[PDB]
């Protein structure tokens, strides 16, 4: 069951074909990731836009107002930086795939793909020579094989000879002088197994030599491709990491920094003010008839 | 205008029920933030759950696929970290709001609330007597307003005693002595404006003092709110903050290590030597008959 059968060297063709798949497979992870990377931006901007209406609308009044007005833009910011790893999920790395794909292999309108149909018969023709001796190999395995079992057995028959009687060779015609030819057609039947199985054992080192090269050339084309993909991994990587740019860092210490700007006394102070016993007033005192 | 009118004060109570009503209105935002966390945490699961699948069954081999499912895992540790910051954001941080709210306001089944109620009726206790006093003002002002007006325009007409004729007082019965009263009429309801006048400014600090003493009670419970509130605020940056536990830096850091795991020369020799021109292989030499 080895890459050294007559055809099992398909499983080498059936990747590079899976090589052109893979680059489908990951081209949709990256595409379904940034829905779901842009689910949540849109949703950190309903929630930032939506509660910026309803606080700056009453009855949170001064400072707190500002300081819980800081979230509403924090989701805002990181609704941002979700919208630029989208961004650039699709229109960098995505686009690298697409374009990786379409440049290493080539379609063939009439075929599956130049790349693994190529490598397929080179292996095919290699495979030429050791298919055929293969299978003269087999007719003179079985040739011999069925030739000679007759001797073995039909020498039980000719042991009867003895046995009974058939004195004179009037009753032992073919009785016992059948194994004459019968064992010369085993003996002439088992040199031409001979001679084919040493064709194919001074043919192999060709058979061998030949499938290496196609093979040696698939391994060639998978690393190319095995090389392009961990590094398209490893931009996806920096991409999704939101650690990356401190603009993330930076968002959650404008919050903190808005949030201790609150003062309680400042809005305290001015409600008092604005609102309250801080009000100036005209105090009753006397008015005149005028008109 | 001002706070020190008859009767606007209501402010400062509307004030203490939306004290009340901005406890909810926070809660509410925090919920509906929660939800949106979660919403990304379960769609990090679906695609890191089922994109497992996809890579774990065919046709991605060796290291390559194993940096890939590095992948499928930190979106699971990503969407571990918003459904921490979810069960963090309510359990935690919501239900202290809830619980202050219910501590510090008290309700009243019959009314609003104790804490609305009872300020509501201070105020109104210390404006009792500048209620009926500001009454007994506008009185004497129109008292002696509208009395004042008849004397100027009344002794127009006088005045006419002199034009025409109206010699003997037969025909100048109170056409000029309407004005005697008249004038007494204008200058005994002066007085009752004038006394009313000074009752008002003798008892001004008393309605001072008065309103003061209810609204420093108001800034006491206001400022214990805001103290609260900023506090939470702080609270929940602290928990939206992903930034804050290393936990997320760790992620990434793993991403890349495993990313850079792949050596594609391993996964190509691996391929080789199972399924290629390295698997042995029984070459073909003789059988002899048997049976």
Redesign the interface.
Known sequence: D????VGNYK??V??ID?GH??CN??MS?VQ??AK?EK??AQ??T??AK??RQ??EK???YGS?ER??G??MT??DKVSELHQEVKNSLLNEDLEKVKNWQKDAYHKQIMGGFKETKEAEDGFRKAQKPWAKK?KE?EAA?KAY?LA??EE?LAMTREMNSKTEQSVTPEQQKKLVDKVDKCRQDVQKTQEKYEKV?ED??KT?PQY?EG??QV?EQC?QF??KR??F??EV??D??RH??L??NSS??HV?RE??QA??G?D??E??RW??ST???????N?????E?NP
Chains 1, 2 share one sequence.
């Open positions: 080895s890459f050294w059968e499983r080498t059936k990747r899976d798949r893979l497979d990951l992870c379904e990731r779901i689910a949540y949703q950190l309903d929630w939506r509660w309803l606080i009453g009855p949170q707190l300081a819980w800081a979230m924090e989701a293969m190999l395995k094989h000679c079992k073995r199985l194919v054992g192999t061998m499938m290496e093979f391994q998978e690393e095995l090389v993909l961990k991994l490893l996806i990587k999704l990491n650690a990356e993330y860092m959650y919050l903190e949030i201790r609150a309680a006394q809005d305290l409600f008092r609102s309250g016993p801080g009000m100036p007033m105090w009753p005192q006397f008015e008839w």
